[PDB]
């Protein structure tokens, strides 16, 4: 009479639901199913702080549809990962955060137990769902409802919380075998109300400006050659948001990008496609017409009037919608005034010389225009890539620059604006595709995963990081102003060698002062397909200091 | 007529309130205050990550009785911080973490503010009080409240909360200064139950093989002459915990640490003194007594009773406790039995041998014994550092055999057994105390706070960082049992060279394979008082995995 | 071999730590717990709704110092009883709510259990702490725990959840015996730093215009001799808040009751003892001197410098604080100026005058000064009862009108001004003293508790409920603003009989329209010791409408 434990039933549950890698960082509970897991097929990935490992798994979730997994220890570890796992919730990538704990009934009394706290509960205000699973008969189900929870609705972080003694707890195996549940669709199609898929293509219709907004919800739903379609057929001008660049081609002759400022002060429809009207769009207030009308396609229906109001909801699934938006286009076709479109164009080809001049015109030191166009040099001939972004001066010029050729191959700080996520999103990217990963990195933003190239080391990924090096925060020329002569706040180490930290792990680094250099470096990092650090010397007086001056 | 503003008050207020450090990271909305309180006077130490200025902070906190300040941004730089003020708080460290904050009015209705969280609720489960001020006239009292709510009772963590808008709300500067507010004596004395103070003598006086257990609220409390004076007078045996090692120095004759599980195995009354019945002492259970009589001195009286039932609870602060305690045994005195001190010191011998054996045992390659020796060796020499100490074997092994000779100079993984509080720790110990640091890491506990290396670069701090480089969590010769071929779970990098990492950042490195080699490196190290990492070379299989076998 | 179960072993905590009465409502899992306490001599009130069980175990409380108990069900009856623990952990009572919850294992996977609510974690924002216990092994030092939580400190409500599944849980009888604890001095004295004292005589020495304010703190301390010893000796003015009333008689000579408005704009010291500056006390703000110098009696060091900066904290408990507050002013004594006693008695003069002529006028229907001036006639000669009151009007003229003789005999709508504690404050009163109660009602406020007169009546309870009829909140005249006739949203029921309810349970009815009525049936009520209610119709035009007038 053969038993098994709860370590080996969830194990098998992930497995019969096709999971095929966990992000995590073991110990106390959780070791021994970690090489399980291995030992059953999984491909497992040990990072240095649970942080990237919850980054790397949410990343896998929004590429894929399926969650990432990311397991954890008790309290300390938990309490790491959370902060990824509430990353997740707000951006809307699914994922499954899997922590062990500790004793219930010592946890339950407060006696200060082994790595105490309530982490199911810890985990509430950071994720869809968090359960906790006491019984080994209940591992299957559990899973089953944590998979639902993640991918359903808007996506997003589930905590399933495993205590040491479930993953103990003996049951009998041919039993244990039928309490294990492999979901089919866990996030089956819901179809918008056919009324308001004709209410908002009878709007568009009339519109005299109409824009869409692609947003990281459009990217996700996959639904790439439907939004081509809709926007070619229409000729509708659409503006990209920084994760659904690449769905259509950003150099992409609709694409309003360009004229971002002049598009969203004058529409007077905006379809937004899975985006949000929050502070990324100001809200749909500074810098936007009076009166815009807006349709919105969401699966979400609370996201509806949190800030304009919303005069075309159509509520569903993206796909699904697009389906019902197409068809009713096929019956009752329009043409976007064509003088909206030639506007536009006035106006995206004026912003374009300007930064072609920016581009183009070479310095001493690199400032973010000819280093970023230097990398576009590259990325040009390297299409087939990932793109990690993170920083301020270097998100922001990254993103205008930077042209995507491919659908979800942007990943950066996101909704909540995260500097940390680099070394996770590239190791995520990297393992789930297969492909090399460029990491477009400010200083600052490098140094809250910094640690994690031992990780790209360990499994030979092929990662090349670009550090903008401008020696701080926004800048690199700040002074102490008590006179004293000390680092100010905003200033990093002068002169840091970040190329020299592969040493330790014996990766490959580069140092570049140059465009010529950078384009070299940059192209045998992809090609070589090698852990890379390329660290580009950047002008300290480059950047900009964002927010508010006083 | 001059205006200020809140930035301006709260600066002020920290000034008057003897706030001479801030730990933190920058960005919007407090580069601004940050600047200001560098101009004003006050340190300013920019980390890497929040969690490491949130440890620096909690140390400074412990080793001062002052609150250590950790300043952050809003939610993503927050929530990093926080994990760390949940640590404060498990451990009982004082700490004012203050977090700049969104638009109130946009993040009550959700509606998607840049880095919206309402971070005041966020930290309540973490904090002992969490705060936020919406008028700059409040900011003065809300410190106030915030530093005698850090530093009373059980000290720990207390969130303080800026919106940006208080930050540049404006008023009078003559009003603004009479909302001030200096706090003095903000934990001040508290006495116990006299009848209380008299039961615990009488107890003891009973006792034939009384104890004292000194906790890390004993070290805090800095009453090291009066725990002296008391353990010499009655000659009663002490097992000092691990951040209570050096109130008495750890050679000290009536010091039952090389006896430790037979001390309490057999003690019949046992004096905890600042230290909770949890899991470090195995909740008063395992290899205890059946029958153990507790007299307990703590300042929480919710934490009388929490484990074994306290046959004499003294509630009070230490110093004061003690100060009856001293008193009272001068008008009754007694004598610890002295069969008790011999049979305590029979196997203290026999324990001390076994050590010496392993200590004294050259081997290549080096294993946790041989190199700890060599590291007390160099120590023995440098009584003046403070120690900084984090793993699994590094850990253990290191509290074991590193003795320490003053109070206050071991800080460690602590009650939630947290890796990754290493730098933070040893930036805030070297800037607290103007001494060298030396940090025992586990080559697995060194990755997750490693990147902070640049930070004590670049303020040129005295830290030694002595890695224990053993090729994994625990131990460093793990299998992929899928045979694939794959890194275990546990295994990082095969023969990594981190002393190779201080290259990047103009540091020192040493790599070390036996114990002439650690010897010289680490006494060069402290006596330079140059940032260096020294990679110890440790037998992969020298170290135990922790846990239950299956 | 004998066996016993968490329910039996429970009970048997409660008796061994002399709980003698608990007050609930039963229903799964927790009926045959309540059986069994009554069976074992235990008193058991049952309530119709668990807020009034919650009110009256926080009333016991408050007047005894141990914990009043409380007992309810799961989800349901939970919530209900937690809105009255929230109100006891406000007002600073001590009492234990003690739940059943549900299955553990399908609460923690939500999957819709009978009554499922994580209880646990739903309490901690209402309670000094919340316990749940699984082992039937750890009943004992979990009840332990709860009451030493419950008084220690600031007292307030702590939860303890009880699953079904422990109070059915085995365990050896003789076993379980040892694990049964008997807290002893659950609240130890805690004595202030001898410096604060030496501050605070020397500030009350120095005062030309001192004021004492006695806050329920003072009245739950019993410190009642200590407290008036002080007072008499340096002939301080002394002002009680509402429910400190009476520790020395309302009609001393030194209280400046009379002058409240008066004594708080023109006293230069202020000594707070138990009293928070909370809205009761404006802050410290409007109708204060401008710089007020305060002296503070708190146990709860973080209530210092809440609102005003404290000059002298004397952190410590009440009663030892005024021994050595005594002791300090025997070695240097001093009387307050005679001149400010003077000057404090024109003012009361004044405004006792303006009062007694109110309450002296007869008018039909009556009104609140005559009204109270026929309670406070008969009361003057029952100094043995208990008084409770609530309401608006019938609050604040109650409170002014009616002088208490003894102290810890006032009970009113406390701290959060909760309408609803009425009945349940009454029986809590009745049950513990065994004396007569008097419950001085508003109408509005009677509804939220009125169902508790069949509890009053089912445990033949001497309590008389006098209820203030005006027909509605604050005034009964109110007029449908619409014109439509409607009842306005403050109008009750014109011409109500309330005292007709007390036919239903064969309790006592009285209507009565002028004084002499009223003085015969509240005398009669008194002397009868039947539940009785009477029915004092107001004019409805008497009442002010509280709040901000537009
Ligand atoms: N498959 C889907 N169908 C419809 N809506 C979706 C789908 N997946 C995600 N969403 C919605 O997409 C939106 C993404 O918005 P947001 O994260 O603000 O994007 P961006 O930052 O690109 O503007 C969310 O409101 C979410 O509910
Ligand atoms: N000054 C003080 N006086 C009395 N007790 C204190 C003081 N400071 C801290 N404490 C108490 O000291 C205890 C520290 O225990 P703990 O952190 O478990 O130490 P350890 O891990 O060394 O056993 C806590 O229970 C805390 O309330
Ligand atoms: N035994 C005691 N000794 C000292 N302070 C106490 C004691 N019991 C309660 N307190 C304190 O008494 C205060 C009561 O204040 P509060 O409820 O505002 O009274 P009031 O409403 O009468 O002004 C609280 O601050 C509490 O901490
Ligand atoms: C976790 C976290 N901490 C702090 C911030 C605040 N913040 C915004 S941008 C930024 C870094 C900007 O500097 P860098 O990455 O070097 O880019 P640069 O502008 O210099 O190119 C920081 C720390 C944040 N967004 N997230
Ligand atoms: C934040 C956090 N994550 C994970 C753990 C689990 N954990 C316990 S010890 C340990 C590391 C042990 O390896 P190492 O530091 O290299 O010490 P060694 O035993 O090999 O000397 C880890 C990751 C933890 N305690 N804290
Ligand atoms: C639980 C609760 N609900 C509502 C209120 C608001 N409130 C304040 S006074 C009051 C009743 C006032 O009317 P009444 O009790 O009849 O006294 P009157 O002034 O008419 O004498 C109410 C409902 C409250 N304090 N508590
Ligand atoms: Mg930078
Ligand atoms: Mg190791
Ligand atoms: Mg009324």
Redo the contacts between chains.
Sequence with gaps: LQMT?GMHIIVEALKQNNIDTIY?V????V??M???A????I??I?F??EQSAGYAAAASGFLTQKPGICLTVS??GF??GL?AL??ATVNGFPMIMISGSSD???V?????????L?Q???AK?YAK?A?????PQ?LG??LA?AIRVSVSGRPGGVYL?LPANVL?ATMEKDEALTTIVKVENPSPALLPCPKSVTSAISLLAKAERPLIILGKGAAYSQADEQLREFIESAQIPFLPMSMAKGILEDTHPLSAAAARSFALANADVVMLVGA?????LA?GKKGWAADTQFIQLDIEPQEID??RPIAVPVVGDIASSMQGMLAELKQNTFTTPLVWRDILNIHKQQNAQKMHEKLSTDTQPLNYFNALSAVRDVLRENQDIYLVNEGANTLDNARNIIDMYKPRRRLDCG??????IGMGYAIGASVTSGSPVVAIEGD?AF??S??EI?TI???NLPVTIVIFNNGG?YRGD?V???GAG????????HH??????M????GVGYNVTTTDELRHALTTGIQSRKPTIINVVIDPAAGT????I?
Tied chains: 1, 2, 3.
Aim: net charge negative; proline share 5%; glycine share 10%.
């Design positions: 434990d995590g073991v110990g106390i509970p070791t021994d970690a090489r399980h291995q030992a059953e097929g491909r497992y040990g240095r702080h309290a300390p309490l790491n902060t509430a990353n219930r009934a010592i339950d009394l407060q006696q200060g137990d082994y790595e105490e309530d199911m509960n810890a205000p769902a359960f906790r699973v006491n019984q209940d189900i559990a409802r919380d103990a949000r009207l929050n502070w990324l809200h949190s800030n909704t909540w604006g995260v500097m940390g600052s140094g809250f910094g640690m031992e080391c360990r499994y925060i700040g102490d102003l008590s000390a680092p100010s706040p905003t200033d990093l180490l840091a060698r970040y190329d020299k930290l040493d330790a792990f014996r200091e964002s927010g508010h006083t």
